[PDB]
């Protein structure tokens, strides 16, 4: 009984959720905007929301419930902290070098080539929005889990048949 | 030089290109819309255009020049025609079984399982839109190029170190 309280995140979710207690990507975009997790920056774009839904969609419903929303909140905060470290000018954007450190402090060791190829895919006039940073974190997590589960020899090299490579990457 | 003419695509490009002769995804979105490549279908959204830029970004600039735009136009025409052979009444969508026959007619060599996962990734109410079909085609061709390049022995298997895998899959 004692030590219970109203979850402060519940309100944002109930404002957008259907009577079934579920939200889809569009509904997720709205309540994330409301939640202030993107701060003063722009809303997450709809591809970023699709990625976030897919990340937590364990019943393959195309939707999430409130418990998953709270899980998502925890994940997004972890990643946001690394971002606001190196968002030294409060831009809501990081440059490629800043990005490299954020991902580094998260424990990704990526080469300058891997970072540059991430930056160029999501740059907007040479800088990466918080929105695109989050999309990138979601994809990195999924593709890294895909790589790791196939590393039989445990030397950081995976033997990828073509068909498996395609399904694996196209599924994200 | 006889047979020289003004290239009819140059105008669409020159209207949005910077003085450097380059376009980013936003600009490409605009000039593909003007160009009429969609026919009666809806315009491509930004994310599909980012994929397009990435498919032809041989110098990792995050932009495209006019010659690459010219290539892109040819490629899209070919894909649009296959799409239309399965969307006779121009609804703007195609279903999963038709997507499979499209990809095989296209030259993509994919297991029924792989095609299934691709159809599920791009379904919305059991239907694949035109924008999502093109996004799929772009992504398949880019990832298949990256794979082919690492498989000059043509064994259909590539040994991918983690950093190269990431560089490669995050760029598209
Ligand atoms: Mg679900
Ligand atoms: Mg900054
Ligand atoms: Mg002419
Ligand atoms: Mg721009
Ligand atoms: Mg035209
Ligand atoms: Mg380029
Ligand atoms: Mg039909």
UniProtKB/Swiss-Prot annotation, chains A, B:
Keywords: Calcium, Cytoplasm, Membrane, Metal-binding, Repeat, Sarcoplasmic reticulum. It is found in: Cytoplasm; Sarcoplasmic reticulum membrane. Ca(2+) 1 binds at residues 57, 59, 61, 63, 68. Ca(2+) 2 binds at residues 87, 89, 91, 93, 98. InterPro entries: EF-hand-dom_pair, EF_Hand_1_Ca_BS, EF_hand_dom. It is a peripheral membrane protein. Signal peptide: none annotated. One of its GO terms (molecular function) is transmembrane transporter binding. PROSITE patterns: EF_HAND_1, EF_HAND_2. GO terms for cellular component: cytoplasm; cytosol; endoplasmic reticulum membrane; extracellular exosome; membrane; nucleoplasm; sarcoplasmic reticulum; sarcoplasmic reticulum membrane. Detected in cardiac myocytes. SMART domains: EFh (SM00054). Residues 3-38, 44-77, 74-109, 108-143 form the EF-hand domain. GO terms for biological process: calcium ion transport; negative regulation of cardiac muscle contraction; negative regulation of heart rate; positive regulation of release of sequestered calcium ion into cytosol; regulation of calcium ion transport; regulation of cardiac muscle cell contraction; regulation of cell communication by electrical coupling; regulation of cell communication by electrical coupling involved in cardiac conduction. Changing residue 86 to L: Reduces affinity for calcium 5-fold. It comes from the Eukaryota. This protein is encoded by an amplified gene in multidrug-resistant cells. Homodimer. Interacts with GCA, RYR2 and ANXA7. This is Sorcin. It comes from Homo sapiens. The lineage of its organism: Eukaryota, Metazoa, Chordata, Craniata, Vertebrata. The gene is SRI.
